[PDB]
Design a protein around this ligand. Sequence first.
Ligand SMILES: Nc1nc2[nH]cnc2c(=O)[nH]1
Ligand SMILES: Nc1nc2[nH]cnc2c(=O)[nH]1
Length: 613
Amino acid sequence: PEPHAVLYVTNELSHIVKDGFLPIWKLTGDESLNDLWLENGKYATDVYAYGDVSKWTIRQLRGHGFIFISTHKNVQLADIIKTVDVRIPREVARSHDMKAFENEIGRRRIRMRKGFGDALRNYAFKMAIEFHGSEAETLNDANPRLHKIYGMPEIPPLYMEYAEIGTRFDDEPTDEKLVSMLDYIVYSAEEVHYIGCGDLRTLMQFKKRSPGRFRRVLWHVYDPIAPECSDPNVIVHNIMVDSKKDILKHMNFLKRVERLFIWDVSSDEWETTRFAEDRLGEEIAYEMGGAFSSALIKHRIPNSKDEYHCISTYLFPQPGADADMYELRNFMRLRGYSHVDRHMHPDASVTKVVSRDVRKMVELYHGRDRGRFLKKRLFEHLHIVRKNGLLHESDEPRADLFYLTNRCNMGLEPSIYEVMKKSVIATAWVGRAPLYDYDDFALPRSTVMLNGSYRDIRILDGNGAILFLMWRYPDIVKKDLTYDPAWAMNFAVSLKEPIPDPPVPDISLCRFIGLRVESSVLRVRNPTDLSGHLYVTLMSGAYVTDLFWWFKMILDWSAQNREQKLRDLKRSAAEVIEWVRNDLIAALREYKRKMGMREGASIDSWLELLRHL
Ligand SMILES: Nc1nc2[nH]cnc2c(=O)[nH]1
Ligand SMILES: Nc1nc2[nH]cnc2c(=O)[nH]1
């Protein structure tokens, strides 16, 4: 809505910037601290800035809005030697196109979005178990035997009771059928009896792309034609399978384990053998249902039969599989130990299927050049627990990232705060620009600031949030981390995180970039300094800081003295950018003088927490 970034470039770039349409900020390594803060605050959009910044730490620079573009790998600071956020290729200076240069920034900026949500997420996996509004990404980095991953994924093309299909959605190519299979089914298994594994090329390429989960899992594999695979998490079996006893003897029963049954069995005049193969793969899974957690039975569709039967939880189309591949994979969820509770997905039963409706599924969703987006949906739907965030009442501690402010939740505002009163970590869209690849809606920043802050609950904007994590848990959140602060500043973030002792004015907390331009607009438009300053912050909705702590920082902390208060900075390894209650109490008042109803309680809460402290 207001928040910008300083697109910082290194010397050799500068000349081309001049030729742009955005404001340029020039340095000049002196510049006091309180110099940057007043200048940077003049820029109501993104800026370009160059020249010497040796004096300064990174935190200092990110709180200011910095993104480090250059041709060189890194740039020298006072803190450390930072990895440039945005490297430019030589040739694409160089050239000296302002446009290809400006485009080049954009892309990496959208790529930078990732790193931001990787820090918050990567902290959540540190402090939590339950998990809400999740997706493949969160599955991807989860520990399936600890974190418990809920959410509401977008349900794929399915056949059971039960039809509905389609409709079609846009999609792109992926990994060939057989490794694109493994990819979505393998997640929480611990042991896999892979029946009919062929020559193993399949599973090896699975290793070659997805190495972690290949090793975090155990593979019995079965074929007349399977070679000796030197791997030690691979016990091979040449034995062909007619009975469930050719698997059974090869499971340790004295210990609990999630086990997965994968069937893929084909041989060599009609073929109602193709049939009683699949049907067998099913019966064998079934008899064992109670030792496996689930199964992916192969399921090709016959010509002869218009309708037929099978045991099924689901039947679905196959990513990366050719268009003419007339073969669905049949899921069976089962009973048997599993670190993911799937009792939503119905207990695999007998299923009447109509060939032509399967025939249609293949027709709609198969294609070499389709699957990517299907596979995802399958993955989630299979392994996420279908549970609604604002409604789930949890016993364990719980994280709430990047779903909260979704357009489907619109109106249900109260429930939202309820979640941010008690989550470990959660985030709300508060950005007021156009604003794309993002389908969220904004919460009023004042209302966030005021409802957000509780003793335990620290309420910062994404950048503050990050700065904080850098500063408190330096190795949950690295310092060299690349991210785009502007974007970080579209999110309100909340953490179950105690106030510092002593409540130092760290950047995580105190930035207030542009608060002077912010105070003037305020006064030409809707007109009514630590008294007025608090009011500005609120009325602007430019800002999201932790009211509570910042309160505590003012009264309980300043005074203290000159000597005795920096000192307690050293120490708390804090850092700043800027070198009584009766103000604040009116600050509040004035605020709600202008805002009956559109708020604020609460307010009342805040006042009555000064008038008692
Ligand atoms: N910054 C950011 N990172 C993510 N990682 C997964 N989803 C998101 C998102 O919406 N934003
Ligand atoms: N099946 C699958 N789909 C994904 N979509 C994004 N990441 C993954 C992954 O690891 N596996």
